[PDB]
Amino acid sequence: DDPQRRAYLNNKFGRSGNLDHDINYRGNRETAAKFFKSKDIDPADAESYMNGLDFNHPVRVETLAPGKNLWQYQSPGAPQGNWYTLSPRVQPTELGINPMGTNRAANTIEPKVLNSYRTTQKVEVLRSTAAPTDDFWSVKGQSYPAKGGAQQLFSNEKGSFG
Amino acid sequence: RNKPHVNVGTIGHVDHGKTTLTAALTKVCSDTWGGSARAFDQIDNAPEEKARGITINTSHVEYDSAVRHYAHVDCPGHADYVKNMITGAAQMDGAILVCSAADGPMPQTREHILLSRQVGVPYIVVFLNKADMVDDAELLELVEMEVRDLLNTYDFPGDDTPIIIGSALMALEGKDDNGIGVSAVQKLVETLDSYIPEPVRAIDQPFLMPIEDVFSISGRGTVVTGRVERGIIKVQEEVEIVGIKATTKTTCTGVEMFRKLLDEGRAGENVGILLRGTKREDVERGQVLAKPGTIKPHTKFECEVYVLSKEEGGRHTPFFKGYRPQFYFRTTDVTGNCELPEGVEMVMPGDNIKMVVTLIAPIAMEDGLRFAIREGGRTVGAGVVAKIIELE
Numbered sequence: 001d002d003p004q005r006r007a008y009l010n011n012k013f014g015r016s017g018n019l020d021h022d023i024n025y026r027g028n029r030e031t032a033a034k035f036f037k038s039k040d041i042d043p044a045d046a047e048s049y050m051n052g053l054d055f056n057h058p059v060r061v062e063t064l065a066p067g068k069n070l071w072q073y074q075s076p077g078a079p080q081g082n083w084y085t086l087s088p089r090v091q092p093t094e095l096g097i098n099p100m101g102t103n104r105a106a107n108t109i110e111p112k113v114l115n116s117y118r119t120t121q122k123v124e125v126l127r128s129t130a131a132p133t134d135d136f137w138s139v140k141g142q143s144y145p146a147k148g149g150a151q152q153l154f155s156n157e158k159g160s161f162g
Numbered sequence: 163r164n165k166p167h168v169n170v171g172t173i174g175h176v177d178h179g180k181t182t183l184t185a186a187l188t189k190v191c192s193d194t195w196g197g198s199a200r201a202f203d204q205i206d207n208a209p210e211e212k213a214r215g216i217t218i219n220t221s222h223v224e225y226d227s228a229v230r231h232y233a234h235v236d237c238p239g240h241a242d243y244v245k246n247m248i249t250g251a252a253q254m255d256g257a258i259l260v261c262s263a264a265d266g267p268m269p270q271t272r273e274h275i276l277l278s279r280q281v282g283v284p285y286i287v288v289f290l291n292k293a294d295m296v297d298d299a300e301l302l303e304l305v306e307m308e309v310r311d312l313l314n315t316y317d318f319p320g321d322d323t324p325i326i327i328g329s330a331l332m333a334l335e336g337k338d339d340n341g342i343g344v345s346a347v348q349k350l351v352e353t354l355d356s357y358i359p360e361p362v363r364a365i366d367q368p369f370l371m372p373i374e375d376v377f378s379i380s381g382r383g384t385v386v387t388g389r390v391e392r393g394i395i396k397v398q399e400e401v402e403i404v405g406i407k408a409t410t411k412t413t414c415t416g417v418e419m420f421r422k423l424l425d426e427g428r429a430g431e432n433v434g435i436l437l438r439g440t441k442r443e444d445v446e447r448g449q450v451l452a453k454p455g456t457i458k459p460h461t462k463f464e465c466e467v468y469v470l471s472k473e474e475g476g477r478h479t480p481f482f483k484g485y486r487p488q489f490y491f492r493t494t495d496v497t498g499n500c501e502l503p504e505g506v507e508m509v510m511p512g513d514n515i516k517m518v519v520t521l522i523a524p525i526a527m528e529d530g531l532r533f534a535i536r537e538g539g540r541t542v543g544a545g546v547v548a549k550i551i552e553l554e
């Protein structure tokens with residue numbers, strides 16, 4: 001088949017170069033959506049969560065045995081989040097989140113504190129690398145761009161983790 | 163009317179409309195060419211098939227065309243397709259690759275094309291499903307070019323491959339708005355009639371019989387007993403003893419079934435054939451009697467293998483590069499080395515991989531030949547000869 005037109009279609013519809021790449025892309029996105037539907041809530045939020053995931057790098061569903069120590073950055077006096085990080089040496093921007101967050105009751109802006117969690121049960125988690133997203137949440141006025149180079153974990157079972 | 167049997171099935175990604183296309187096929191064929199329609203829910207709720215190996219949830223349906231009788235296979239999940247394809251449990255003379263045009267190609271699509279190439283599926287017809295959800299024809303054109311690229315990628319004639327645009331759901335519900343409904347599925351069946359060739363009958367294939375046992379009486383002669391897999395052996399016909407050692411040439415002086423001495427031995431029959439001027443030291447197990455120049459022995463070959471999980475009786479441990487499992491070919495056990503694919507050095511029980519096997523003894527083999535992999539005499543995996551690796 002004559003090229004150029006294939007290039008025309010690829011450029012027109014989003015496609016970028018090799019087919020295998022976009023195929024893996026689609027597969028990872030599908031895996032994310034499937035996880036969000038399969039585990040607890042799947043409303044409007046699922047899309048916003050989805051924006052935070054980078055699908056070029058592989059995003060896989062995994063089951064985690066108890067006793068695994070994972071940690072997460074959370075604003076001072078803020079409730080436990082759904083996102084977690086494997087290694088403490090990861091920068092906050094790398095996780096697709098603002099280094100600092102809002103602190104309620106105080107209503108003041110304060111650096112996010114790293115908290116250490118352990119698994120008390122066997123829990124299902126969605127492994128994924130963070131996308132480079134803008135972090136308008138956790139800062140009322142500041143919108144914060146994030147590098148998003150690091151891996152993430154997602155589980156709405158807060159009781160199982162926290 | 164006279165119509166011959168042909169084996170087909172639906173393959174593709176999840177939720178792309180495999181089962182839906184199946185129900186559409188049986189419905190349209192029932193309404194058009196006559197027959198018994200089938201239910202979506204019955205097929206989707208695929209019953210477990212026990213087989214002789216791992217439990218595979220497989221749905222079998224049947225539908226007749228104008229000139230053919232079609233036996234169709236559908237599976238709920240990709241794992242089912244892996245187990246069903248790699249093992250002989252389902253034979254397809256033609257494959258129907260259904261791909262959602264609205265979503266485009268997906269990992270299991272390309273993986274199913276790859277598996278079709280490896281396991282020996284000779285022909286693939288592509289049905290571009292969910293064409294009702296797409297208003298832009300340019301997208302259909304693009305996805306068409308994409309699936310053609312995938313087919314060309316895995317040695318399928320994608321340029322000449324018949325691609326049909328339509329919607330399995332719109333066809334099943336009997337509306338046929340535009341050209342997408344029952345007309346499209348009708349054209350699909352017609353395409354199955356015109357593109358997919360007729361299966362060669364096992365009795366029309368060249369002669370092939372795995373030697374099960376060998377009886378030799380010094381002065382009287384040697385007779386080899388076993389079950390004829392392919393073709394027909396006749397008295398005074400020349401045959402080749404292939405496998406284990408050097409290929410030998412012989413002549414069938416007689417065919418014996420129980421007490422009876424027959425004019426010939428046909429496929430499916432358990433017989434004992436007398437070999438002229440042969441000795442027991444010349445004939446071993448695993449060797450096969452074949453039509454001259456139809457089969458050859460090989461030691462090193464690329465194959466696709468599926469490892470049994472711990473539940474289905476498989477091992478509790480992954481593989482290495484120096485793994486030396488037993489390989490069961492037809493009627494014999496043969497020790498052989500195995501080479502893992504690039505980037506991988508560990509495979510868990512339940513995975514399917516492209517493995518390069520190098521046997522210690524040459525075995526008469528062909529492309530597409532299914533074989534077993536055993537540990538301590540018990541099956542730990544199953545595979546199929548993807549491609550013979552020549553040494554020249």
Ligand SMILES: Nc1nc2c(ncn2[C@@H]2O[C@H](COP(=O)(O)OP(=O)(O)O)[C@@H](O)[C@H]2O)c(=O)[nH]1
Nearest residue numbers: 176177178179180181182238292329330331332
């Ligand atoms: N909107 C729409 N949905 C479809 C169409 N074809 C199939 N589907 C949906 O795809 C879903 C999956 O069906 P299917 O892929 O055949 O089941 P599977 O064989 O187990 O993967 C069904 O629930 C259908 O509702 C279509 O043309 N339009």
Ligand SMILES: [Mg+2]
Nearest residue numbers: 181206237238
């Ligand atoms: Mg199904």
